[PDB]
Structures are given as C-alpha cells and as structure tokens.
Design a protein around this ligand. Structure first.
Ligand SMILES: [Cl-]
Ligand SMILES: [Cl-]
Ligand SMILES: [Co+2]
Ligand SMILES: [Co+2]
Ligand SMILES: [Co+2]
Ligand SMILES: [Co+2]
Lengths: 381, 381
C-alpha cells in the first residue's frame, strides 16, 4: 500500500517516541528483575504488550521506560515511603540492565542529541521516567540523584496524594492542587532540568503547575476530556494552559480513557483524540503516550508495540500532513526535552539556588563547641 | 629548604590521593547539606580539619570523599536500614553539589584517566566511597545504582555487623568473617568494578575477602598492627595476603591507631607505619588514608589537610626514594582502581551473570493466568 509505504518512510526519517511504557514493571512481576538467561523470553514474551521482537516490528524510534513502583500501602507510613525509594532503585537498575544487555536494540538516551544519535545507529532511544513523587520518599536530594541515574521526567503523582501534589483518582482532595512544597518543587524541577509530567495529577494540580512552570511540561499518558470525560483526561482549560506552557499532551491508549464502553475503544478513537488536540492547540503540542504494559488489553488496532505503523498510517489517512505526523510521532517531545534542558542551563547559569532537604540536627551544642575550640587551637599553631 | 623544594616538585609531578576524608559528613553536621551562600565558610571553616583554602595549601592531588552515614540504631530494624539508604543519597547529593559549585578547585573523577585529567587541569580529583554495606539497605540493585552515581569503593562494614560481613570493633562476631551473602557480593563487586575496602572489617573478614577477591582491594584508612595493636589495624598475616591480592594499605592518621597514648601520636609515627609496610610488602602496596574529619584531633605535624607537604618531605628525609614516595602518594591507589576496572571489563566481557536482589512475588497465579490468556488472544490475531 502507498500509505503503508509512507508510514514506513516517516518511521525511518524521524523517531516515534512513546511517552510511557510499563515493561520494566512487567519484568518485576514476571522475572522479578532476574533477566539472566531470559533472552528467548525477552524477545518473545509469554505475557504483556511489549517484547524486543515486537518492539523492532513496530519501528518505534524511542521510549520513555517507566520506573513505576506502587503507591505505599503499609500501615507504617515512613516504611512504605522508604520502601518505594528502594524499589525505585531496583526498577532503575533493571531498566539499565535491560538496555546494557541488549545494546543492538536499546540505547540509553537522556537528551535531544542522545535520542537522535541512538536513532541514527538504528536503536530504540531508551529514556526513563518515574510515575509519582511518592517514589522519592520526600527527599529532593534523592530526586537529584534519580536525575543523575538517567531519569528525565517525573509524574507528580500516581493514584495517591503525596506531600507535593494531588492525584486525579483519589477523593477527597488533600492540597486542592499543588502544596506549598509542590510549588517550591516546580522551581527545583525546572532548575535541575527534570521534565514535569502531569498525567495522573488532579485538574487543579495541572492548572497550577501549568501556570507556575518556567519550562514546558508533558502529559506522558493522558487523553482528552471533551471526547471522554474522566478524571485522568485533560480538560479544555488545561489544554489551553498547556499551549501557553509550550508543553505536549501525549495521547493514551487506555480504553477507559478513550470510550465509556471499554470494549468499544479503537485505533480510530486514538486518532480522534490526537486530531482534537492538534486542531485546537496545534499539532506541535500533541504526542503519543501509549501506556502499553500499564493495561491488560489495548484498543482494537493497537493491541501491542508492533501496531505503531497502523497509527502513523491512520493519521495520514485522516488528512494530517506528513510534517504534523512527524511532530506527533516524536519531534514535539524532543523539543520539550530540549527546552527543559535549555531552561535548566540558563537557570543554573544565572546561579539559582537549589532546593535543599529538611535535615535534622545530628550534633548537639556540646559537639559543636569541641569542634570550634579544636579549630581555634589549630589556628594558634 | 631543598627537601621542601623536592616535596613540592613531587606533589606537582604526581597526585597525592588520600584514601578517606569525612568532610561531607562535617557539612551535614554543620550546614546540614545547605551550602547556598556558605562559600566564605567552605573556604575558611570554623570547625574541622578540611576546607577549600587549606585543601589547596597542602597540594593534595586527589581525594576519595566519604559518603558515610551512621550505622542504623532505630528499634525498627527495617526503618533504620532504609533510612541509611535515603541518608546515603543525601550525602552523595551534597558531595556532587560541593564539586559542581567549586569547579576551579574540585573535579569529579571515577577512573585512572579521570584522576589524571583532573590533576593536569590543576583540580583535586574528587572520588567517592561509602563507609559500610549498611548504607545499601540489603539491596544489590541499590549498590549498582550507587556505582552509577560515582561511588568507586565500598567499605564492607563500619562499626556494625551487617548481612555481608563483620566489623572489627563489635563483639561477639556474627558471621566470623564474611557471610554466604558476603562471599557472593565479593564476586558482584569484582564484576561491576567496585573497589573493595577492608577498613573497619574484622581480621577474619579481611583474610577471607583477600583470598576470595579476583581484583585488588584497599584499606582506605587503616594502620599496622605490629607497631600498634588494635582491632582496626592490619595484621602481618593480612598484610601478606594483601601483597598476593595486589592491594594497597592506605595508612591512617587516627591517633588511637598510631600509638597507645593518643596525645603522643605524631607525623613520625605515620612515617614509621608507611616504612614498616613498604619494607615488608614493598612500597607499591602502601598508600595514604588520613581519615581527616573522622577525628576531632590529628597527630602532631598532621593537624589538617594543609600538612601533606610535611609528610612527603618526611618520607624523603627517612631515605624513601622519590619513585617509592610517588607510589605511596598516589600511583598505587591509581593502579588498584585501574586493575579493578580492567577485572570488571574482562568479567563483563566474558558475560558473567550479575547478582540479583531477592524480590518478592507481586502477582498471584490469578493475575498471571489473565496475562497469559491475554497474550495468546493477541497471538491469534
Ligand atoms: Cl537532527
Ligand atoms: Cl600518565
Ligand atoms: Co505506568
Ligand atoms: Co499511568
Ligand atoms: Co569515615
Ligand atoms: Co572510618
């Protein structure tokens, strides 16, 4: 088919960069992060919507691999929070090991330049994002170390309220948007060059984050509210504030977010959602955020990661121009990551002060007096 | 003085690389890891044995900055262990921020090549080590992420027994050396290219680690047992096994480890300890491991980080050859780090399997059956 040829050509010209895939958590469920001698299974998985053979088949250019861990449910609240931090390092560890053991398919990327160089080599550009600020255990230091480990976006919440922001699916509201800590964290995320992700966050938390952020943000996996009313979807108000923010809404393949009846959801609905956003806020602010392996079943026509060429062909069939399809595929999310890193470079270049942790006093006054007396003794010499 | 001129020349030819300095924990005690607008104090500290002015004055070429956190003392044992992991990320964060905010003085290094390039630029080569396996919270995944954050050695214990090995100063013995986990961790540390540090570990744990390790190890800050009998010092038996291992004993400035009467300890004693080891196991297996800022007061003549030229001159005055002084200064610890990285490269190159964490089952059989049924439905299409 000529349109299938056109879609294949576009997929080779520019990388289709998917906003969210939970294949690392599927590895934790199935293999329990032990992938030694599991290559036959990693290429041909007995479960899920992602494996390395189907990943090649769909001609995907890049991927933000989710380092999701569940919201803490332990009665001991400090233990649950600290457990999430240890589990986060396990998920970052298995993502890095997945990339390093399969260098011909996957190549790690943390920037616009690293995405392109990965794509030129014929590799899937493998980026990392964490799904919720519960994962950092209330530690801004830990968050900066997650950035150093290769994390390039942070979803502000998952399906639980935290110290910083409100989740969409939890009632009642705790903060009614962002907290005072949350507002201060927006500045720190902009300063360090961490891309803000507004999926899973409440409508009010989106509105506040979109006005406050000095860098463009993303929705790593969210759909349109006007087409399908859901707490997880993006309202017209927040779509306009995303336009001002210069951000990108990466459209989700979750069936509950595309249609009221789940079994009726399709590839055509995903394209309706992409076209709606592209029509109203322009095609430079729309992306693709599948949430593959964050669901049991996908829409009809988008059952797994091999189905991306059908989406590219489907967009072209509707009359979306090649240039606008390339934008939706990956150029938009590359631009946001590029602008996030430029905003960080200019804020760091202007000597903006970093957000410190709230640390307890480890020494009493007796320890400090011994230390100051000792220093002055050395000054006398 | 001609010998002072000779010492100054040697300090400019090769980097004096100190094995252990606890200045990052002093920043946590004094500033509480908030160094914003504290440059006047960071250059001229009101306490302690390390600041950025005195660091320049002593002509130090490199430094393994300690990311030490205390052994957990909480009644809730899981919380204490998980707390140590969060505190470790705070200490790694402040070390990286200390280096990044002072690029003219400090430059981060994680290899032999990066140490040299830092030294050629006129910077103190800033490496990182953690003081105890309590810091990883029983997670080998976390340990691999600490390596990715820039940690290049791990002290197996501090002053507490852990799951892997026995500390020197705690009785009774738990494992009587290394545990079965510890033995398995030695292989993993060799595979990843993490330098093993045997300071603070029991005599039996040293003996076992020295026989088992495929890469050379270090004592980041330990002294000689025959000159001064202490649990923390290295016995003749372990000095010989260190020679076979090809490791380096980095001599400590702790007064309790140099003499029975603490106030009688001196620079001359440190040189006696260096010469003892250099005479018996050769000068290619001896180093300098001050433990500055891990003590209130230092020996007479080694009161702070500005006193390194006195040590270099003192070694030359005793009749230690220029070539052997250069070895003790830094060439030996560079060689160990170089060999540790080569052993890792050859073990990784031979496809040796990594040590995985013990992970719990997150899915029941009902979840797994839904996933396998769902996959087979997609295969039918
Ligand atoms: Cl380009
Ligand atoms: Cl050289
Ligand atoms: Co997810
Ligand atoms: Co999600
Ligand atoms: Co220490
Ligand atoms: Co110590």
């Amino acid at each position: 088919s000529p349109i299938e040829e056109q879609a294949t050509r576009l997929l080779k010209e520019v990388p289709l960069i998917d906003g969210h895939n939970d294949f690392p958590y599927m590895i934790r469920g199935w293999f329990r992060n032990d992938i030694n001698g599991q290559d036959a299974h990693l290429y041909d998985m007995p479960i899920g919507q992602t494996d390395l053979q189907r990943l090649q088949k769909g001609l995907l250019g890049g991927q933000f691999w989710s380092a999701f861990v569940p919201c803490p449910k332990n009665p001991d609240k400090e233990v649950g929070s600290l457990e999430a931090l240890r589990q986060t390092l396990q998920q970052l560890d298995v993502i890095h090991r997945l990339i390093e053991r399969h260098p011909t398919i996957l190549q790690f990327a943390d920037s616009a330049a690293s995405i392109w160089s990965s794509f030129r080599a014929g590799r899937v550009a493998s980026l990392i994002g964490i799904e919720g600020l519960h994962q950092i255990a209330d530690s801004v230091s830990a968050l900066r170390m997650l950035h150093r480990l290769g994390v390039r976006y942070v979803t502000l919440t998952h399906n639980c309220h935290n110290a910083f922001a409100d989740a969409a699916t939890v009632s009642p509201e705790l903060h009614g948007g962002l907290s005072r800590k949350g507002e201060r964290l927006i500045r720190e995320l902009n300063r360090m060059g961490m891309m803000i992700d507004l999926s899973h966050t409440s409508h009010e938390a989106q509105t506040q984050a979109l006005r406050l952020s000095r860098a463009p943000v993303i929705y790593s996996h969210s759909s349109i509210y006007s087409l399908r009313a859901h707490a997880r979807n993006v309202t017209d108000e927040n779509l306009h504030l995303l336009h001002r923010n210069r951000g990108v809404v990466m459209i989700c393949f979750l069936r509950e977010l595309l249609a009221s009846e789940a079994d009726q959801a399709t590839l055509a609905h995903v394209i309706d959602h992409i076209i709606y956003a592209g029509t109203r806020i322009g095609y430079e602010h729309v992306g693709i955020g599948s949430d593959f392996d964050g669901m049991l079943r996908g829409p009809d026509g988008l059952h797994d990661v091999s189905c991306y060429p059908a989406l590219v062909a489907g967009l072209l069939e509707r009359g979306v121009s090649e240039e606008d399809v390339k934008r939706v595929m990956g150029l938009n999310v590359i631009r946001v990551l590029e602008e996030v890193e430029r905003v960080a470079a200019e804020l760091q270049g202007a000597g903006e002060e970093c957000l410190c942790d709230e640390l307890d006093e480890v020494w009493n006054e007796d320890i400090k007096e011994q230390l100051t007396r000792e220093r002055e003794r050395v000054r006398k010499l």
